């Protein structure tokens, strides 16, 4: 029906994402939240008949700040999707009360999910804002410049355009789906 592409011509296969990921993502992370706390979870999923279906939501063990987040226990993490066949098909993180956007640390980190994965999805939330995006590294051109950038800090400008809105809904479809939210901390 609807196709998405990356900008190197490469076909994406759709995601389906359970309308409900969002809200009960932002209410299992909502003490941090309140904390003006950044939290990330994990979109974890199947493939079948050449579509990927989120099926689990993972908040990891992790350690945050105001404009950071970050898995410290990499193992359960790992243990968990093992467990259970679950591909990484993105992830999911709040700004608290910034605007939503990918920051420099968002970008890069970005990159090692869409390096495994060329759907690999970054679902960012404001939900001090009531606003939400979910985002992908240009490809190839994004993907290039973050790998190539070794400029220090965690809050460094990139040269060119590096990034963009997912096509919905042609690359993610948010649909009726079944949801499992696990919570390893
Ligand atoms: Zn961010
Ligand atoms: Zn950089």
Redesign the pocket.
Request: no cysteine.
């Given at each position: 029906k609807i196709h998405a592409y990356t900008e190197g011509g490469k076909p994406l296969r759709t995601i389906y994402l359970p309308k409900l990921l969002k809200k009960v993502f932002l209410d299992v992370v909502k003490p941090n939240t309140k904390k003006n706390l950044?939290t990330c979870g994990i979109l974890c999923g199947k493939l079948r008949q050449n579509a990927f279906f989120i099926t689990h939501l993972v908040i990891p063990l992790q350690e945050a700040t105001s404009?950071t987040c970050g898995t410290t226990d990499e193992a359960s993490l790992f243990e968990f999707q093992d467990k259970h066949n679950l591909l990484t098909l993105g992830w999911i993180?709040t700004?608290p009360t910034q605007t939503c956007f990918?920051?420099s640390?968002?970008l890069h980190t970005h990159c090692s999910y869409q390096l495994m994965l060329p759907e690999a999805i970054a679902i960012?939330m404001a939900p001090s804002k009531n606003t939400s995006g979910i985002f992908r590294l240009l490809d190839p051109e994004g993907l290039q410049t973050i790998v190539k950038c070794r400029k220090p800090g965690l809050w460094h400008p990139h040269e060119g355009k590096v990034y963009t809105m997912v096509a919905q809904p042609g690359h993610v479809r948010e649909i009726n789906s079944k949801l499992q939210v696990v919570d390893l901390r």
């Open positions: 950044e404009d993180h700004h990918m920051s640390v968002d960012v």
